[PDB]
Short mmCIF file of C-alpha atoms and ligand atoms in Angstrom, two decimals:
data_model
loop_
_atom_site.label_atom_id
_atom_site.label_comp_id
_atom_site.label_asym_id
_atom_site.label_seq_id
_atom_site.Cartn_x
_atom_site.Cartn_y
_atom_site.Cartn_z
CA UNK A 1 0.00 0.00 0.00
CA UNK A 2 0.77 3.74 -0.05
CA UNK A 3 -0.15 3.26 -3.72
CA UNK A 4 -3.85 4.04 -3.25
CA UNK A 5 -3.47 7.33 -1.38
CA UNK A 6 -0.77 8.63 -3.73
CA UNK A 7 -3.10 8.05 -6.69
CA UNK A 8 -6.04 9.87 -5.10
CA UNK A 9 -3.72 12.74 -4.17
CA UNK A 10 -2.43 12.88 -7.74
CA UNK A 11 -6.01 12.90 -9.03
CA UNK A 12 -7.04 15.77 -6.73
CA UNK A 13 -4.10 17.82 -8.02
CA UNK A 14 -5.12 17.18 -11.63
CA UNK A 15 -8.76 18.01 -10.85
CA UNK A 16 -7.94 21.18 -8.91
CA UNK A 17 -6.07 22.27 -12.05
CA UNK A 18 -9.02 21.83 -14.42
CA UNK A 19 -11.29 23.48 -11.84
CA UNK A 20 -8.93 26.48 -11.91
CA UNK A 21 -7.69 26.05 -8.32
CA UNK A 22 -4.17 26.54 -9.63
CA UNK A 23 -2.69 27.64 -6.31
CA UNK A 24 -4.47 24.80 -4.51
CA UNK A 25 -3.04 22.36 -7.06
CA UNK A 26 0.52 23.61 -6.49
CA UNK A 27 0.07 23.12 -2.74
CA UNK A 28 -0.84 19.47 -3.38
CA UNK A 29 2.10 19.07 -5.77
CA UNK A 30 4.30 20.13 -2.84
CA UNK A 31 2.74 17.31 -0.80
CA UNK A 32 3.34 14.72 -3.54
CA UNK A 33 7.01 15.71 -3.42
CA UNK A 34 7.32 15.40 0.36
CA UNK A 35 5.36 12.14 0.50
CA UNK A 36 7.36 10.22 -2.10
CA UNK A 37 10.62 11.24 -0.38
CA UNK A 38 9.64 9.00 2.56
CA UNK A 39 10.25 5.26 2.82
CA UNK B 2 32.49 45.57 -26.10
CA UNK B 3 29.78 45.25 -23.44
CA UNK B 4 28.66 41.84 -22.24
CA UNK B 5 25.16 41.00 -23.58
CA UNK B 6 23.46 40.72 -20.19
CA UNK B 7 20.41 42.47 -21.64
CA UNK B 8 19.74 39.45 -23.84
CA UNK B 9 19.44 37.28 -20.70
CA UNK B 10 17.74 39.56 -18.17
CA UNK B 11 15.47 41.37 -20.66
CA UNK B 12 14.54 38.26 -22.67
CA UNK B 13 10.91 38.07 -23.77
CA UNK B 14 10.43 34.35 -23.00
CA UNK B 15 12.20 32.60 -20.14
CA UNK B 16 12.56 28.82 -20.03
CA UNK B 17 10.85 26.28 -17.82
CA UNK B 18 13.03 25.41 -14.84
CA UNK B 19 13.32 21.76 -15.88
CA UNK B 20 14.61 22.85 -19.30
CA UNK B 21 16.65 25.79 -18.02
CA UNK B 22 18.58 27.88 -20.53
CA UNK B 23 22.30 28.58 -20.42
CA UNK B 24 24.09 31.43 -22.19
CA UNK B 25 27.88 31.48 -22.34
CA UNK B 26 29.26 35.01 -22.02
CA UNK B 27 32.83 35.75 -23.11
CA UNK B 28 35.17 38.32 -24.66
CA UNK B 29 33.44 41.38 -23.23
CA UNK B 30 33.30 43.87 -20.36
CA UNK B 31 30.41 44.03 -17.89
CA UNK B 32 29.58 46.55 -15.17
CA UNK B 33 28.18 44.30 -12.45
CA UNK B 34 27.18 47.22 -10.21
CA UNK B 35 25.15 48.62 -13.10
CA UNK B 36 23.53 45.20 -13.46
CA UNK B 37 22.74 45.34 -9.74
CA UNK B 38 20.97 48.69 -10.21
CA UNK B 39 19.33 48.13 -13.62
CA UNK B 40 16.10 46.84 -12.03
CA UNK B 41 14.44 46.08 -8.71
CA UNK B 42 15.44 42.52 -7.77
CA UNK B 43 13.99 40.55 -4.87
CA UNK B 44 17.12 38.37 -4.74
CA UNK B 45 20.69 39.28 -5.69
CA UNK B 46 22.78 36.94 -3.53
CA UNK B 47 26.44 36.42 -4.46
CA UNK B 48 28.44 33.62 -2.84
CA UNK B 49 31.91 34.54 -4.02
CA UNK B 50 32.43 38.31 -3.75
CA UNK B 51 30.13 41.31 -4.17
CA UNK B 52 29.08 43.15 -7.36
CA UNK B 53 31.66 45.82 -6.57
CA UNK B 54 34.39 43.22 -6.14
CA UNK B 55 33.39 41.55 -9.41
CA UNK B 56 34.06 44.83 -11.24
CA UNK B 57 37.83 44.38 -10.71
CA UNK B 58 37.84 40.69 -11.68
CA UNK B 59 38.26 38.88 -14.98
CA UNK B 60 36.96 35.41 -15.82
CA UNK B 61 37.44 32.89 -18.60
CA UNK B 62 33.69 32.42 -19.12
CA UNK B 63 30.48 33.55 -17.47
CA UNK B 64 27.45 31.26 -17.74
CA UNK B 65 24.00 32.79 -17.32
CA UNK B 66 21.34 30.23 -16.41
CA UNK B 67 17.77 31.55 -16.59
CA UNK B 68 14.32 30.11 -15.81
CA UNK B 69 11.05 30.75 -13.95
CA UNK B 70 9.91 29.27 -10.63
CA UNK B 71 7.61 30.20 -7.75
CA UNK B 72 8.70 32.87 -5.29
CA UNK B 73 8.68 30.34 -2.44
CA UNK B 74 11.06 28.11 -4.45
CA UNK B 75 13.81 30.71 -5.01
CA UNK B 76 15.27 29.63 -1.66
CA UNK B 77 16.16 26.28 -3.26
CA UNK B 78 18.43 28.02 -5.79
CA UNK B 79 21.28 27.98 -3.28
CA UNK B 80 24.09 25.53 -2.44
CA UNK B 81 23.23 22.75 -0.02
CA UNK B 82 19.47 23.09 -0.53
CA UNK B 83 16.95 20.30 -1.06
CA UNK B 84 13.42 20.46 -2.40
CA UNK B 85 11.31 19.77 -5.46
CA UNK B 86 13.20 22.29 -7.58
CA UNK B 87 16.68 21.58 -6.20
CA UNK B 88 16.30 17.79 -6.31
CA UNK B 89 14.56 17.43 -9.67
CA UNK B 90 14.91 20.67 -11.66
CA UNK B 91 18.03 22.81 -11.04
CA UNK B 92 20.82 21.91 -8.61
CA UNK B 93 23.71 24.12 -7.43
CA UNK B 94 26.96 22.58 -6.16
CA UNK B 95 27.98 22.90 -2.52
CA UNK B 96 31.10 24.84 -3.60
CA UNK B 97 29.11 27.33 -5.69
CA UNK B 98 30.86 30.54 -6.76
CA UNK B 99 28.44 32.95 -8.40
CA UNK B 100 25.31 35.03 -8.02
CA UNK B 101 21.62 34.09 -7.86
CA UNK B 102 19.38 36.90 -9.15
CA UNK B 103 15.58 36.86 -9.10
CA UNK B 104 12.64 39.22 -9.49
CA UNK B 105 8.85 39.02 -9.55
CA UNK B 106 7.40 38.52 -13.04
CA UNK B 107 3.70 38.30 -12.21
CA UNK B 108 3.13 41.10 -14.74
CA UNK B 109 4.65 39.00 -17.55
CA UNK B 110 4.33 35.28 -16.73
CA UNK B 111 0.86 35.21 -15.13
CA UNK B 112 -2.32 34.95 -17.17
CA UNK B 113 -6.05 35.16 -16.53
CA UNK B 114 -7.23 31.56 -16.29
CA UNK B 115 -3.69 30.23 -15.93
CA UNK B 116 -0.46 30.39 -17.93
CA UNK B 117 0.54 26.78 -18.64
CA UNK B 118 3.71 27.54 -20.60
CA UNK B 119 5.99 27.07 -17.57
CA UNK B 120 6.58 23.50 -16.38
CA UNK B 121 8.45 21.73 -13.60
CA UNK B 122 9.45 18.14 -12.94
CA UNK B 123 7.43 16.59 -10.10
CA UNK B 124 8.82 13.04 -10.20
CA UNK B 125 12.35 11.70 -10.60
CA UNK B 126 14.06 8.50 -9.50
CA UNK B 127 17.06 10.37 -8.05
CA UNK B 128 18.31 13.87 -7.31
CA UNK B 129 20.04 15.89 -10.02
CA UNK B 130 23.79 16.30 -10.12
CA UNK B 131 24.92 19.95 -9.98
CA UNK B 132 24.11 21.73 -13.26
CA UNK B 133 22.57 18.54 -14.67
CA UNK B 134 19.68 19.08 -17.09
CA UNK B 135 16.90 16.50 -17.48
CA UNK B 136 14.42 17.14 -20.31
CA UNK B 137 13.08 13.59 -20.65
CA UNK B 138 9.35 12.88 -20.40
CA UNK B 139 9.34 9.16 -19.58
CA UNK B 140 6.26 8.10 -17.64
CA UNK B 141 7.22 7.84 -13.98
CA UNK B 142 6.67 4.52 -12.21
CA UNK B 143 5.57 5.66 -8.76
CA UNK B 144 4.14 2.32 -7.61
CA UNK B 145 5.06 -1.34 -7.92
CA UNK B 146 3.49 -2.13 -11.28
CA UNK B 147 5.38 -1.46 -14.54
CA UNK B 148 4.05 1.41 -16.62
CA UNK B 149 5.05 0.34 -20.16
CA UNK B 150 5.17 3.96 -21.32
CA UNK B 151 1.46 4.59 -20.62
CA UNK B 152 -0.05 6.90 -18.01
CA UNK B 153 -2.23 5.23 -15.42
CA UNK B 154 -2.53 4.11 -11.82
CA UNK B 155 0.74 5.16 -10.14
CA UNK B 156 2.09 5.92 -13.64
CA UNK B 157 2.47 9.67 -14.05
CA UNK B 158 3.64 12.10 -16.67
CA UNK B 159 6.71 13.56 -14.92
CA UNK B 160 6.05 17.24 -15.72
CA UNK B 161 3.37 19.51 -14.27
CA UNK B 162 2.48 23.09 -15.10
CA UNK B 163 2.64 26.05 -12.77
CA UNK B 164 -0.56 27.53 -14.19
CA UNK B 165 0.43 31.02 -13.02
CA UNK B 166 -2.55 33.30 -12.39
CA UNK B 167 -2.09 36.99 -11.45
CA UNK B 168 -4.33 36.43 -8.41
CA UNK B 169 -1.99 33.85 -6.85
CA UNK B 170 -0.38 34.74 -3.56
CA UNK B 171 3.07 36.27 -3.79
CA UNK B 172 4.80 33.02 -2.82
CA UNK B 173 3.20 31.22 -5.78
CA UNK B 174 3.61 34.01 -8.34
CA UNK B 175 6.26 33.51 -11.04
CA UNK B 176 9.78 34.84 -10.49
CA UNK B 177 12.35 35.04 -13.26
CA UNK B 178 15.69 33.72 -12.03
CA UNK B 179 19.15 34.32 -13.50
CA UNK B 180 22.11 32.36 -12.11
CA UNK B 181 25.60 33.65 -12.98
CA UNK B 182 28.53 31.25 -12.81
CA UNK B 183 32.04 32.73 -12.92
CA UNK B 184 34.49 30.29 -14.50
CA UNK B 185 38.25 30.77 -14.07
CA UNK B 186 40.18 28.18 -16.08
CA UNK B 187 43.93 28.05 -16.74
CA UNK B 188 43.25 30.21 -19.77
CA UNK B 189 42.91 33.89 -20.75
CA UNK B 190 40.30 35.65 -18.61
CA UNK B 191 38.33 37.57 -21.23
CA UNK B 192 35.20 38.48 -19.23
CA UNK B 193 36.23 41.50 -17.16
CA UNK B 194 34.39 43.92 -14.94
CA UNK B 195 34.32 47.58 -15.89
CA UNK B 196 37.24 48.44 -13.54
CA UNK B 197 39.80 45.67 -14.09
C1 NAG C 1 16.42 46.17 -19.69
O1 NAG C 1 15.79 47.24 -20.43
C2 NAG C 1 15.75 48.51 -19.77
C3 NAG C 1 15.02 49.45 -20.69
O2 NAG C 1 15.38 49.24 -22.05
C4 NAG C 1 17.16 48.97 -19.44
O3 NAG C 1 17.11 50.21 -18.74
C5 NAG C 1 17.87 47.91 -18.60
O4 NAG C 1 19.22 48.30 -18.35
C6 NAG C 1 17.86 46.57 -19.33
N1 NAG C 1 18.50 45.55 -18.51
C7 NAG C 1 19.72 45.07 -18.77
C8 NAG C 1 20.23 44.02 -17.83
O5 NAG C 1 20.39 45.46 -19.73
#
């Protein structure tokens, strides 16, 4: 696991983009970076 | 024979940070204190000596790296830093000798509805070497299943867009960044400050 939550987080980022929440998307992108840096 | 710093700083279109541009500057004279005062910069941090000390120095080459990032990411353009931009987009060596220059470009690089011309790398299997440039767009395997070159579950396109909008907060607004490297080889130093 960890796979399922990363995918939903990626999908929220992509959806916040298309819904014009550009700043909100970038804040999730930051989380995707910090998350995948952990073992 | 003035150094063509105007072509870098006053360029119409800056590059995405993951595909950062590099201009080699040579065989010319440059007033670095005039560069310091030619515009209002939010960052002008030199790690060797100051603008005024550069004006008495000569160098073999000067490399001007330019790109656009978020204001809150300019901190990563410094030696010893880690982060999404420093790990996966543009990395400075620990022994860096040069200047990092940056200014707000919300008036140029933001757009109503979102400017998607500027990209950044979100995923990478390992951190970049100093001054390494990675422009590949292989699908990133984030999970345990192979991706076979197709986007899908835990299989992501490695690049994302900033989507700059003029109504972003200051920390998310676009900043144009110019990084100057001062190269002194065992060779004629032909890039000299205005008072060498
Ligand atoms: C950019 O253009 C302005 C106006 O033409 C000029 O005053 C300024 O010195 C230029 N910047 C550089 C680095 O040459």
